[PDB]
Structure 1
Amino acid sequence: NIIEQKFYDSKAFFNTQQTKDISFRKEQLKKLSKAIKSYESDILEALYTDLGKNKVEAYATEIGITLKSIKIARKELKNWTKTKNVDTPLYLFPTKSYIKKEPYGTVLIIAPFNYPFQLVFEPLIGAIAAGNTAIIKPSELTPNVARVIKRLINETFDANYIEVIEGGIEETQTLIHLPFDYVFFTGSENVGKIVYQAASENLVPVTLEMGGKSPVIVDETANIKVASERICFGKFTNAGQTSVAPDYILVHESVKDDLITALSKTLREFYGQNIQQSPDYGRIVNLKHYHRLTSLLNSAQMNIVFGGHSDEDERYIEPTLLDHVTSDSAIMQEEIFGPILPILTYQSLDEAIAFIHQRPKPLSLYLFSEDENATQRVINELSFGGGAINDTLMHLANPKLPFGGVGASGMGRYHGKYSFDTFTHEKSYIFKSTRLESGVHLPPYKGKFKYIKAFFKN
């Protein structure tokens, strides 16, 4: 019962009020930053062994972005946390209005395998800065990363302030049935449904970052070569294991063959002729997901127009393009979460929009177009978590942009101040001086109806 003991110890530490002190929170952020730097080599090694993640990609998407976020949160903390004076309308004078920013208490953070470090620590920064205690459940599919995370945390913080729980679905099961004050989850739709039903039993608020199939629309006005470069960048980073990676392409009939040519050329520019030898290209997390993806390769074997090679001993899957893909294809029935890119054609933008609107709202959407009005149509008519015009993936790199889904792709958002907001309850309160008395708004109300009605109607 150590999980539940760890939970109630964390609650007990929150009850001491020590995490509400602003200077306490700043010091924990310093220690977190110092701790990540001390472990930088071990984190890079763990990301490399578990995901084949090269150090450039690992720094830009896991370590460096976290260090930058800690720095910003620590330096902006007084701005984010300070009670706001809120305007009070004249009719409420002499009332003064305020909003106190306060923590929820003890929160739960669940992180998946694909960015196993960043998806632990970007939520954690928000939880720390908002004044919470935290329990972290990292992915056991990346076990070296999870252990490095546990070592780092345990040697830096008390377990009753921040603790890491290693395990699989059953450890997650134990955690989500505990009355946490907030639950933050990134992962699959399947597990997200379980987390959110368990939390609902305890009236626990949640943020869910889930999945779907993110479409890329490439219309007939697009800059094909630049589109192919930015698509491949967002698609084959982390070997496609990204929730906002281009899942599939809807390309206008007239430029499909141009796009296939440009994508193939870009992949050779990126990774060379033997992509298995490229030090810039990652690997599949484990054998289960590797076989999931090679099964999809086998299903689309007649449609491969680039790549398709694999090596089980390295959990390697070559960047692969598919042509003549339909709605019936196995590759269009599941979130790919891998380096397979199916290409479907459309004749008019209305068909592309209809296709996307028939499916769950995706976490991201991308449109490549030089046509302003097509851009406007897509942003206005299709709902999705967030996206990009003439780019992919990089809308996550601005911390001033909230990152989150909608509908099946999730609820809630984070990054930057939104990470702080997510773990913050905003508490409105007023003050009215007792030296200033008036019976105007008190009973008896005889004769006051004409006055109160005129107020609400002038």
Structure 2
Amino acid sequence: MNIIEQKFYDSKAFFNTQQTKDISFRKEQLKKLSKAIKSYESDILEALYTDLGKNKVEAYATEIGITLKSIKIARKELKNWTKTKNVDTPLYLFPTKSYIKKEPYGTVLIIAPFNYPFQLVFEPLIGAIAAGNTAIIKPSELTPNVARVIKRLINETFDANYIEVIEGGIEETQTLIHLPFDYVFFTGSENVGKIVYQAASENLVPVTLEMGGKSPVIVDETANIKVASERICFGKFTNAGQTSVAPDYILVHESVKDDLITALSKTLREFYGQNIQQSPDYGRIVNLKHYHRLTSLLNSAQMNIVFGGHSDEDERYIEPTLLDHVTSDSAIMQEEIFGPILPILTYQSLDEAIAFIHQRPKPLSLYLFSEDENATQRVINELSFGGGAINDTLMHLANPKLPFGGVGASGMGRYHGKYSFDTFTHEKSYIFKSTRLESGVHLPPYKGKFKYIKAFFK
């Protein structure tokens, strides 16, 4: 009765035909998706480069390669993920049989951001397809050519009543989130996350939200500064900072603080050489507006740049900038940076570092560079965060056996690997008690049965 509603009702109607629930069907659409991505493979990278200055290597590894292997893993495991699970039954309920069926939710909404525009559409989508749902996809219009390449790939591969792509901004998102989807999957900002979560509450819709925060990295008195410098910079300088799990700021112990900076800068040259603006290993800011935002942050923290700093408006360039003498109350530590600026703060005792992170909202990721075991055991035991890495950054996302998701302000729910499948699955317990052997052990009248009932639970 309206354009977006028209497509929503058609997707729901196709699901109710129930072709989606058949495993043969799902295995085949996974195949078509793998083939379609490979067919558009250079049609994914032209758009990633024009929208995000994303070079072919990292673009492939973060958006195309990761999903192609995810499709493969899902096709290999589809029969295990979907198979009904038999469940041990208690002896006092004998002969009852116990099962858990893995059934889809129905029609599913996927909202994806701008920074990994392809990855965050298709990793959940693989889950939804594998789980037997229909899907309506909302990709970011901040990366417009990526968005249309996704629409072209989806329209060419699938019928709209099975998977469809709605392009647009907040207006279209508002129409979608107020529709009665059977599941909503969202990656993006805490603020839009709140908009989605409140909109889903009205129709009692379950959701997975993956938002952000400020990911700490504790560089400890016992650290291996050399490797940490490289490891941290990979995490921070891939996609030019725009990564919900990128290190947002460093909590570096007093003693090692100056070492790090040289190590950083030196191993930053090992990454993009002198004059990074000419490197074909380093990305760009998504947009003029995000640009004028991160430049203003550099212009306000200009007293404290210690390595990097300049920027060209015409190609949305900002170089790997490192800050120093930063404090809890400065403007750079008020918001999530989501850019190539790395503020560095000093700490004396580990208790203060932990306390500093505790006072703040729970981050999506947390990183500790330390060789001390008692130190790691307490950073891990007392700080709650989404996920993270001891002596590494980012690369915990690369293992699809580890769920990826936030906690508290950083998010709820999780995906990657099987978890993508589980996010879009309802686990339906059912039992089966044959009628040949009937009894009466728990039925009425109770008269003198009390003893036997107490014995059921003792």
TM-score category of the 2 structures, normalised to the smaller one: over 0.9
CA distance in 1, matches of 2:191, 2:137: 20
1-structure distance, mates of 2:389, 2:346 = 20
- The separation in 2 between residues aligned to 1:345 and 1:89, in whole angstroms, is 57
* Deviation, structure 1 residue 395: 0.3
User: 1: distance between equivalents of 2:111 and 2:456?
Assistant: 51
Report what 2:457 is aligned to: 456
Secondary structure (helix, strand or coil) at the match of 1:246 reads coil
CA drift of 1:456 comes to: 1.9
CA contact (8 A) 2:442 2:453 kept: no
CA offset digits 1:284-334 (Å, max 9, x no partner): 000110011001001110100000111100100000000000011111000
Q: What is the rounded CA distance, in whole Å, between the counterparts of 1:57 and 1:122 in structure 2?
A: 17
The share of aligned pairs that are identical, in percent, is 100
Distance 1:228 1:448 in 2: 71
CA distance in 1, matches of 2:413, 2:293: 29
Structure 1 unmatched ranges of 5 or more: none
Q: For 1:30 and 1:182, how far apart are their aligned partners in 2?
A: 24
CA-CA distance at 1:132 after TM superposition: 0.1
The offset of 1:90, in angstroms, is 1.0
C-alpha separation in 1, matches of 2:90 and 2:457? 13
Secondary structure in 2 matching 1:101: strand
Shift of 1:351: 0.1
Q: Deviations over 1:196-232 (max 9, x none)?
A: 0000000000000001000000010000011111000
Number of aligned residues: 457
Q: For residues 87 and 233 of structure 1, what CA distance do their matches in structure 2 show?
A: 47
Q: Which residue of the partner structure matches residue 232 of structure 1?
A: 233
8 Å Cα contact 2:51-2:143 kept in structure 1: yes
Q: Matches of residues 22-421 of structure 1 in structure 2 within 5 Å?
A: 22-421=23-422
- What SS does structure 2 have at the residue aligned with 1:313? coil
State the Cα distance separating 1:425 from its structure 2 match: 0.2
> What SS does structure 2 have at the residue aligned with 1:116?
coil
Q: What SS does the corresponding residue of 1:356 show, helix, strand or coil? A: helix
In the alignment, the residues of structure 2 paired with residue 308 and residue 199 of structure 1 have an alpha-carbon distance, to the nearest angstrom, of 42
- Greater Cα shift, 378-387 or 445-454: 445-454
Q: How many angstroms apart in 2 are the aligned matches of 1:32 and 1:57? A: 21
2: distance between equivalents of 1:299 and 1:373? 39
Counterpart-to-counterpart distance in 1, 2:311 and 2:31? 43
CA RMSD in angstroms comes to 0.5
2:319/2:340 contact within 8 Å kept? yes
- 1:36: Cα distance to partner? 0.3
For residues 106 and 416 of structure 1, the distance between their equivalents in structure 2, rounded to whole angstroms, comes to 21
* CA deviation after TM superposition for structure 1 residue 451, in Å: 1.9
**Structure 1 Cα separation of the partners of residues 233 and 225 of structure 2:** 12
Cα distance per residue 1:143-197 (max 9 Å; x no partner): 0000000000001100000000000000000000000000000000010000000
Query: What are the Cα deviations for residues 324-379 of structure 1, in whole angstroms up to 9, with x where unaligned?
Result: 00011111000000000000000000000000000000000000000001000011
Q: Which runs of 5+ in 2 are unaligned?
A: none
Q: For residues 363 and 5 of structure 1, what CA distance do their matches in structure 2 show? A: 36
Query: Aligned with 1:15: secondary structure?
Result: helix
User: Residues 120-163 of structure 1: CA distance to partner in whole angstroms, max 9, x if unpaired?
Assistant: 00000000000000000000000000000000000110000000
Residue 344 of structure 2 aligns to a residue in which SS? strand
Question: Secondary structure in 2 aligned to 1:285?
Answer: coil
- The CA deviation at 1:433 is 0.6
Q: How many Å separate the matches in 2 of 1:329 and 1:294?
A: 16
Q: What is the alpha-carbon distance in structure 1 between the residues aligned to residue 207 and residue 364 of structure 2?
A: 17
> Equivalent residue of 2:343, what SS?
strand
User: Matched residue of 1:394: which SS?
Assistant: coil
Following superposition, the deviation at residue 454 of structure 1 comes to 3.2
Cα displacement string for residues 411-452 of structure 1 (whole angstroms, at most 9, x for unaligned residues): 000000000000000000000110011012110111111221
| Contact 2:211–2:411 (CA under 8 A) maintained in structure 1 | yes
State the secondary structure of the residue aligned to 1:254. Answer: coil
**Inter-partner Cα distance in structure 1 for 2:203 and 2:436:** 43
CA–CA separation in structure 2 for the residues paired with 1:450 and 1:424: 41
Q: What secondary structure, in the 3-state scheme, does the structure 2 residue paired with 1:374 have?
A: helix
Question: Are 1:447 and 2:414 an aligned pair?
Answer: no
CA shift for structure 1 position 455: 3.3
Q: Structure 2: how far apart are the matches of 1:251 and 1:351? A: 11
SS in 2 for 1:396: coil
The equivalent residue for 2:7 is: 6
CA distance in 1, matches of 2:183, 2:55: 34
Distance 1:184 1:36 in 2: 21
Q: What is the rounded CA distance, in whole Å, between the counterparts of 2:18 and 2:51 in structure 1?
A: 39
